[PDB]
Amino acid sequence: SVLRELVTYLLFLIVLCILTYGMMSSNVYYYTRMMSQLFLDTPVSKTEKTNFKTLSSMEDFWKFTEGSLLDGLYWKNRSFIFYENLLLGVPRIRQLRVRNGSCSIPQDLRDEIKECYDVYSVSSEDRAPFGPRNGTAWIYTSEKDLNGSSHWGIIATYSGAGYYLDLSRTREETAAQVASLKKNVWLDRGTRATFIDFSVYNANINLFCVVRLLVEFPATGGVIPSWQFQPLKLIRYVTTFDFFLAACEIIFCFFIFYYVVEEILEIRIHKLHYFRSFWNCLDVVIVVLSVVAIGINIYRTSNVEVLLQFLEDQNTFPNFEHLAYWQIQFNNIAAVTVFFVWIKLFKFINFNRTMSQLSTTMSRCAKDLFGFAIMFFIIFLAYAQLAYLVFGTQVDDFSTFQECIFTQFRIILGDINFAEIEEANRVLGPIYFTTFVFFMFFILLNMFLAIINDTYSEVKSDLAQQKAEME
């Protein structure tokens, strides 16, 4: 009975471990590491030191895109990166821009300040063509006429439209085009973000990387760079081992079809709304996250009707940005699902006498232990209020409220020198730090111990009234 259900479970765990390990191999990491060495670690020129990761001005962006992009794409026909990759078609540079009359300045200092610009919103975007209005670069297109989509940066979320220039395939014919975008002014104070996109396919491995290199210019203009390198298998039935991964996907689809029959067989005929004993709620989460991952693997990653349009024409830009976004979502859903498979091993483990004592302890405690985890976070989210308002202008580690929480857990592990904390504020800085280490490590940690210490000492004495009363 129950040993029949373990065989239907342990067969489901081996088909899942084959499929997830078969997707992300060990041959993946050394490819997306060496691509990150060429574009992010090589300096912009032979005499300077700044990387792409350390761009600090608009003029540094120009000495990058003629300095190390042109040495990084092109290896003198076609362009084999590291003599074994291949540059697919053309890259292109896009640009987002803000209108001139986009802020209201007060009437008192109207004299010195002439014209202003705004932070990137969709309502404050520039659309009128400017400058040398010859080509497709100096004229705005919409986000539908270009086959693009949104992307979520560090400051804001940028739309898919803008001012795109589609550069060429050789070293001598892009360095003319990029230098014609420097002689004519293509980046001024009204720009918010530019980013570069291309795709590279190996012949030695059936796998293709899709690069994206954001550089976003804030108001009070500095430079915030960002990147994204992702390999993608898109030719799928080649060897014998990927025949077997195709034969292991349908077996996974049979087990999820096997579980959804058992789901409405257990809610309908009995125990309707009595399905709330935490091993029936975990069975819902694994089966909801699995059918979402089935739908992504069908509709959004098996849509290779973009690549077949590019494999005919070797001279255009391949749009793999809508295809590589669903590879993030497929690897986030199919890794939370693997995490919620190893947790349901706890339902079965439960063999010894000394294994039931450790499950009775953690299950009779979690009523009391959840009650203190609310009182823990209200103190914990009140120090995050204080540090964000006091240190949030001086210290990198307290920059946003989402990142003021993450740096509190670093205190618990160590990991903070606070020589920036006592320098940012002289008095209230160490009043924060000492009364945080005092309350977390003398009070709020020792109370979590005292709950599960008296609970385990009450389970074990209860079973001594179960052995010495039934002796």
Stretch that binds a copy of itself, among 123-131, 136-144, 169-177, 338-346 (CB under 8 A): 338-346
CB of 455 to a copy of itself, least distance (A): 8
Under rule CB under 8 A, which residues in 282-311 are in contact with a copy of itself?
A: 308, 311
| Alpha carbon distance 373, 452 (integer Å) | 13
130 or 380: whose CB is closer to a copy of itself?
380
CB of 300 to a copy of itself, least distance (A): 18
3 state DSSP class of 363: helix
3 state DSSP class of 94: strand
Overall size of the chain counted in residues? 471
Binding string to a copy of itself for residues 37 to 76, with x set by CB under 8 A, is what?
x------------------xxx------------------
CB of 348 to a copy of itself, least distance (A): 11
Q: Is 442 left (phi over 0), alpha (psi -120 to 50) or beta?
A: alpha
From the CB of residue 229, how many other CB atoms can be counted at a distance below 10 Å?
18
Residue 274 sits in the site that holds a copy of itself (CB under 8 A): no
291 or 366: whose CB is closer to a copy of itself?
366
CB of 133 to a copy of itself, least distance (A): 24
Residue 371 sits in the site that holds a copy of itself (CB under 8 A): yes
Given 202, 290, 301, 319, the residue binding a copy of itself (CB under 8 A): 202
From the CB of residue 69, how many other CB atoms can be counted at a distance below 10 Å?
23
Given 15, 251, 256, 386, the residue binding a copy of itself (CB under 8 A): 386
Task: Return the residues preceding each gap in the chain, C–N over 2.5 A, or none.
Answer: 76
| Alpha carbon distance 452, 455 (integer Å) | 5
- Is 245 annotated for ligand binding? no
| Alpha carbon distance 286, 344 (integer Å) | 10
| Alpha carbon distance 247, 414 (integer Å) | 48
* Binding residue count for a copy of itself, defined by CB under 8 A: 138
- Is 413 annotated for ligand binding? yes
Given 246, 288, 389, 463, the residue binding a copy of itself (CB under 8 A): 389
Stretch that binds a copy of itself, among 44-52, 266-274, 278-286, 418-426 (CB under 8 A): 418-426
* Sign of the torsion formed by the C-alpha atoms of 375, 379, 380 and 384: positive
Residue 109 sits in the site that holds a copy of itself (CB under 8 A): yes
Q: Which residue has the tokens 């929480």?
A: 405
Residue 30 sits in the site that holds a copy of itself (CB under 8 A): yes
Q: Which residues contact 252 (CB under 8 A, 6 or more apart)?
A: 15, 16, 19
Given 1, 272, 414, 468, the residue binding a copy of itself (CB under 8 A): 414
| Alpha carbon distance 199, 311 (integer Å) | 13
Residue 342 sits in the site that holds a copy of itself (CB under 8 A): yes
Given 157, 460, 463, 466, the residue binding a copy of itself (CB under 8 A): 460
**Single-letter code of the amino acid located at 443:** I
CB of 51 to a copy of itself, least distance (A): 15
Given 448, 462, 463, 466, the residue binding a copy of itself (CB under 8 A): 448
| Alpha carbon distance 59, 186 (integer Å) | 12
Given 11, 14, 34, 128, the residue binding a copy of itself (CB under 8 A): 34
From the CB of residue 183, how many other CB atoms can be counted at a distance below 10 Å?
8
Q: Which residue has the tokens 């039931």?
A: 356
Given 139, 245, 291, 452, the residue binding a copy of itself (CB under 8 A): 452
* Residue of 82, 23, 42 whose CA lies nearest to 202: 82
- Binding site listing for Ca(2+): 413
Binding site: what residues are annotated?
329, 413
